[PDB]
């Protein structure tokens, strides 16, 4: 059953500095879709294929893995109607962690 | 201005295995609130204060940092009304990455 929602949505600068110092750091991707509220979502492109060991060099005996978690968003449906909507759940990389491979040939 | 939403929301087992092999792994916290759609959100408690170097031991010269990203959720408001709602944006740890400290006394 449909229902009402009031669209009135209800220090950041420091977390980027910690994430930039990660050993499996990432950049941002402008995942934008207009028939979608929120209009713009920023996701994580991992910056390396490996992780960054003590030298400051990439270590390909490790993996940067992007962390994917589903989140809630709205799609205008009928695909053109600015009124009617649906709650949708979509998958978005939210950052990267470093994982050890299992296989070593 | 308020609007309508149809609440019809629109392999997982393998990503946990990669995350369990992270060097800054995490557990799940049942962040539940009934006057909140979604009812239950699972967040990341980092499993260590350091990261897990080659031995399989914790390395306290590093930090497990939980990655925090805001997500969209609904709050029943008036706080009891099952009809009226608001779109809210809340902060939730979505996983952990390993970061190098800056200070070394």
């Amino acid at each position, epitope marked *: 059953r449909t229902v009402m929602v009031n669209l009135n949505i209800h220090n950041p600068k420091r977390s980027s500095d910690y994430y930039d110092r990660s050993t499996s750091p990432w950049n941002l991707h402008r995942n934008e879709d207009p028939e979608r509220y929120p209009s713009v979502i920023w996701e994580a*492109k991992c910056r390396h294929l490996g992780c960054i060991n003590a030298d400051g060099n990439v270590d390909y005996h490790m993996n940067s893995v*992007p962390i994917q978690q589903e989140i809630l968003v709205l799609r205008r449906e009928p695909p053109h109607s600015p009124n009617s909507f649906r709650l949708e759940k979509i998958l978005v990389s939210v950052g990267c962690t470093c994982v050890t491979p299992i296989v070593h040939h | 201005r308020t609007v309508m939403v149809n609440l019809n929301i629109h392999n997982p087992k393998r990503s946990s295995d990669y995350y369990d092999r992270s060097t800054s792994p995490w557990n799940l916290h049942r962040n539940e609130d009934p006057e909140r759609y979604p009812s239950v959100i699972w967040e990341a408690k980092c499993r260590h204060l350091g990261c897990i170097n080659a031995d399989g031991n914790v390395d306290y010269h590093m930090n497990s940092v939980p990655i925090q990203q805001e997500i969209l959720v609904l709050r029943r408001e008036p706080p009891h009304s099952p009809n009226s709602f608001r779109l809210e944006k809340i902060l939730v740890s979505v996983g952990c990455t390993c970061v190098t400290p800056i200070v070394h006394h």
Partner: nanobody, 125 residues
């Protein structure tokens, strides 16, 4: 999640260059590690190159190192492979793949999923 379309490639004499292209139809792969594999018939599936989600980190097989380059857009809609100074060793069916798993190093083909039929690149003696 997406379909992988490939263009470029054909028949070339040694020392020459092809430039293969691979596109994301029905979805993007912006945040996905990408790569290229190759297989000549009867033989196993070789690694060729892999590219960072951001496009900033690139690895190459020890057979193509210094000849081949991998790159990509930022839209998540294209990855490219450029093959210079071609040798008949290089004769194979090429596949762009997405890195779907993480069971090995970035170099480990078994972590990449090709979608379609390949791209034939024949290099002449």
């Amino acid at each position: 999640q997406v379909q992988l379309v490939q263009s470029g490639g054909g028949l070339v004499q040694a020392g020459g260059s092809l430039r293969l292209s691979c596109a994301a139809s029905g979805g993007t792969f912006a945040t996905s590690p990408m790569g290229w594999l190759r297989q000549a018939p009867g033989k196993g599936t070789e690694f060729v190159a892999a590219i960072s989600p951001s496009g900033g980190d690139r690895i190459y097989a020890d057979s193509v190192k210094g000849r081949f380059t991998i790159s990509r857009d930022n839209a998540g809609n294209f990855i490219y492979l450029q093959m210079n100074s071609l040798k008949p060793e290089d004769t194979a069916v090429y596949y762009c793949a997405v890195r779907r798993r993480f069971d090995g190093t970035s170099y480990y083909t078994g972590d990449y999923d090709s979608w379609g039929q390949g791209t034939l690149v024949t290099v002449s003696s």
